[PDB]
């Protein structure tokens, strides 16, 4: 998903986030950049899900930092060459706020809140209930109250190309 120019450019940008003492190639490939530095990058700073994006691409058990390889994975998924299948798969992981494998009413509520902003312009209790009910009506095929991956990939594939 990334060209060689993109990988080499990514390494130079990644290294600018490290202390001077960790900028050798070997040190840089062992380094873990905390989210605070990642969340300020132009590619992420304006993204409403930046905090969820960091978490999903982190490979450390504490899910609180990004390695260079994790950072290449993030760029790979957000590149213009990434397939519709991979984008909807990672979108599902990003929207799964509690990380339990399905999108429930709480996940959908947090997703809507991300789209509007924390609050003023926040949706009211009634507006949120009506929106979530409508989302579930279109997406939850087996009617068990949650949206699993296949339901999600199916609903996305039937939507216009967000290109």
């Amino acid at each position: 998903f990334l060209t060689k120019q993109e990988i080499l450019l990514a390494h130079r940008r990644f290294c600018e986030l490290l202390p001077q003492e960790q900028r050798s190639v070997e040190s840089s490939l062992r380094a873990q950049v905390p989210f605070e530095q990642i969340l300020s990058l132009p590619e992420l700073k304006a993204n409403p899900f930046k905090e969820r994006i960091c978490r999903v691409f982190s490979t450390s058990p504490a899910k609180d930092s990004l390695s260079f390889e994790d950072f290449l994975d993030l760029l790979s998924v957000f590149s213009d060459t990434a397939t519709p299948d991979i984008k909807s798969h990672y979108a599902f992981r990003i929207f799964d706020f509690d990380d339990d494998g399905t999108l429930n009413r709480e996940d959908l509520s947090r997703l809507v809140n991300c789209l509007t902003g924390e609050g003023e312009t926040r949706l009211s209790a009634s507006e949120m209930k009506q929106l979530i009910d409508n989302i579930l009506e279109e997406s939850d095929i087996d009617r068990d109250g949650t949206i699993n991956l296949s339901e999600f990939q199916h609903v996305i594939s039937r939507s216009p190309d967000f290109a």
Partner: peptide, 12 residues
């Protein structure tokens, strides 16, 4: 379509 808007917010 709600999902179009949410994917555009994420990948746009």
């Amino acid at each position: 379509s709600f999902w179009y808007g949410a994917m555009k917010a994420l990948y746009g």
